Amino acid sequence: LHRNSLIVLADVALFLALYHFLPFEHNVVLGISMLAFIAVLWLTEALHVTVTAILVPVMAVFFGIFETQAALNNFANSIIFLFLGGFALAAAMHHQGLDKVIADKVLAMAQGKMSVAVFMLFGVTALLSMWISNTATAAMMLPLVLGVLSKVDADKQRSTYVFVLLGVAYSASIGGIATLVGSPPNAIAAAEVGLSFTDWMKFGLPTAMMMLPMAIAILYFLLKPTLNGMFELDRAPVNWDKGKVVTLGIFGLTVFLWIFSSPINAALGGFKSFDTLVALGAILMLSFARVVHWKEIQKTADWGVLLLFGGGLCLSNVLKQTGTSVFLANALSDMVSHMGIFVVILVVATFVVFLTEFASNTASAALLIPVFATVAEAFGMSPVLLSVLIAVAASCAFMLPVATPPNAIVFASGHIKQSEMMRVGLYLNIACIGLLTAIAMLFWQ
Amino acid sequence: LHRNSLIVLADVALFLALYHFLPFEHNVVLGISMLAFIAVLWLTEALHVTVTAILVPVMAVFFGIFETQAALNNFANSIIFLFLGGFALAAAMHHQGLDKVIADKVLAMAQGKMSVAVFMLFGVTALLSMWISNTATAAMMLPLVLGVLSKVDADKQRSTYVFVLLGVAYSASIGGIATLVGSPPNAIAAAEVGLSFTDWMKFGLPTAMMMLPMAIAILYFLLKPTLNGMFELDRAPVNWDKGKVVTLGIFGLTVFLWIFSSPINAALGGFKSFDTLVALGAILMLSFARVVHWKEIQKTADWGVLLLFGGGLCLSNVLKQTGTSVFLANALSDMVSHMGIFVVILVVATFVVFLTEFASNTASAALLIPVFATVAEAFGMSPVLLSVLIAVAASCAFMLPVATPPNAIVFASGHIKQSEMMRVGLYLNIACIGLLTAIAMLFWQ
Ligand code: NA
Ligand code: NA
Ligand code: NA
Ligand code: NA
């Protein structure tokens, strides 16, 4: 009777149709029919992102692509644990309140000026985003933004207080593109192509360094009258208590090891997924140093996302095993030989950046990273470039809400108009496709 | 500075000592030193049960026993997912309220008599326990017990209202021994020896059928004056709403397939971990039929327990790979040849039943099932008997609280004395060691 039940029923019909009607070697039919089925369920989200992910192995297994255990093992991938370390590391510094002190210390650095208030709000949202989440950093930033935007309270004076809202909304998404922990797409890319933490930062951080100014400049050069106003630093001041220095200590050490992982691991005998070990080490150091309880990490952890990771890897393998990867590569062979490498990555970049407006960031990467990376491998090229590209591009949701929760969070603020965001985003999207295709061209040789 | 930090530091010393001082082939030293380390951390619970479990792979990997991914794969074992199915199945019928209606319908079956009130409370606690949890079924039962025990309110008349409290506390633990989902020890045994859902019920259910009457009979034949009193059926009546029949429908179908798994799977082509697939199927049926959301399952799911599962399997493998299983089997060789098979299982059964008073049910099984099952295999015997034995025995916590949360739940009721429970439990423990050794002898040939 419901909308989504129909989407699902329609999808079941679509599969049954594709299955009985496509004219290929049986494996390819099955692979294509599945790829289509899942593609729908993740882009529509008729079933939860995670329920769909659990559906992948169960299909794989029932259609004899893999054996139950083999399909399930997909879920214990090392990256999934590296991401659990991220959740624990965040769990700690939220419950400890280290996210509050980093907000005040940097926010009070601005003596009482609105010019250097919001400009220090975007820098904090993005910095906090690098390690925490996008949705978490958005909902955590909202009261701190509405707090500041209460002196220039006149909401007939909207564009002073819309530049500041939509600013952090993007700063949370752009801050996600900094490191391997931060947003699921990045992790999906890492798991698909086997990136180290320090590998995804070599790509991502320079892009966030570039993108955040470019995003503010575009929001700025629309309707900003913010060079005026005063502050209201209203609430109890913060102070480093029982080892917020310790949480910072562990965090710092953890980040240090993640960066210097290459020479540390190499000069240790070369352990296998050193970054995942570091991440698990953090979960231990944080528990031995008593700084955060487990129930805290179990609440903070988005296990739904952790299951999505495995389900998407399961899919990636379903594509190889059924040969659907090679079949598509054969089909696209003429199209891609006629297209220049510029043309291809411009088309890829454009596609995602606009697709990601219609569906979840991760849900988009969950679908696209496998399809592309595997087809890339069928062409005998390194699946890294396309994957990292899609990873970044999926986190470029700037037009409407529903694109990302961070958009729908500053939107429920019953103030910003649908039309307004839709056109700053339309600009920033094109602006991004430039920067990405640009940087993607640069990181070639 | 804290107690547990010292326990941990002492343990680190113990390891360092055992490591540098034991006189064996290096692998055995490492294995023994590890086995001792983890043994402590799970029995003391100086670190959380789950943090310790995460510690197992990280050790294994660092001490070159396994490669990072190999050790981590331990966590994607099919049983872990079967148990996630259990969490989802419970999540549904709690949020749906099917646990409330099963309580009232069966509780109001008793017209208004205290004699058939508490006797229908134990039967419901145990029945509800089979599928939900122990701790969850205890905390859910407490208000419903205090509700009834308010007509015979005189707490100078204690033993009317202590028999009813300590009754459900045990009924929740004994109801856990019915099926594979229900209490983690049971799952640990299943994962160690590869039991099917229907396999653990063949053992377990007859034991719960036997044990629950035997437990009431012992609580009864102490200080019961409950053949007197009246009811107070006070609260809004229940009624089957938007497919509580559907949740019951899915649940029923799921349980049906779990029982008939052998012939259904065999007459389906023999899929690998059919019970796990059934469990995942339940997660899907429950979501497609819209009866429960995902965030609900993510709250209900004890991911901490799910991680514990894998960490304990990682341990089991650590023992084999380092040959510590074979080394202990060699050491116990003379002791066990001098001991009759009765003697052995009487010693095993006694050991756990009393050990489980001092530490968590699961924490006990997490340590003991691997050590025994593997040593059993070194002797070239089926690891099943010993494992299933330990699994049941670990859920026999009847003496003090701290033994199980269900004990500490009816204890905070600021009414039951330390001494009182300690002696009913001392009787029931011996009573159990009889029944177990008895049944364990019977299920031999
Ligand atoms: Na982020
Ligand atoms: Na998106
Ligand atoms: Na139970
Ligand atoms: Na116990």
Author numbering:
A (entry chain A), B (entry chain B): 18 to 462
Article passage:
Membrane transporters belonging to the ubiquitous divalent anion/Na+ symporter (DASS) family move Krebs cycle intermediates or sulphate across the cell membrane typically by utilizing the preexisting Na+ gradient.
Herein we present the structure of succinate-bound VcINDY at a resolution of 2.8 Å, which, to our knowledge, offers the first molecular view of a substrate-bound DASS. We crystallized VcINDY in the presence of succinate and Na+, and determined the structure by combining molecular replacement and multiple isomorphous replacement and anomalous scattering (MIRAS) phasing. Specifically, Na+ in Na1 is coordinated to the side-chain hydroxyl of S146 and side-chain carbonyl of N151, in addition to the main-chain carbonyls of S146, S150 and G199; whereas Na+ in Na2 binds to the side-chain hydroxyl of T373 and side-chain carbonyl of N378, besides the backbone carbonyls of T373, A376 and A420. Within the Na+-binding cleft in VcINDY, the electron density for succinate was also observed. The bound succinate makes contacts with VcINDY mainly through H-bonding interactions and is partly exposed to cytoplasm, indicating that the transporter adopts an inward-open conformation. Specifically, the side-chain amide of N151 and the side-chain hydroxyl of T152 donate H-bonds to one carboxylate in succinate, whereas the side-chain hydroxyl S377 and the side-chain amide of N378 make contacts with the other succinate carboxylate. In the succinate-binding VcINDY, the Na+ ions in Na1 and Na2 coordinate several succinate-binding amino acids and thus stabilize the conformation of these amino-acid side chains.
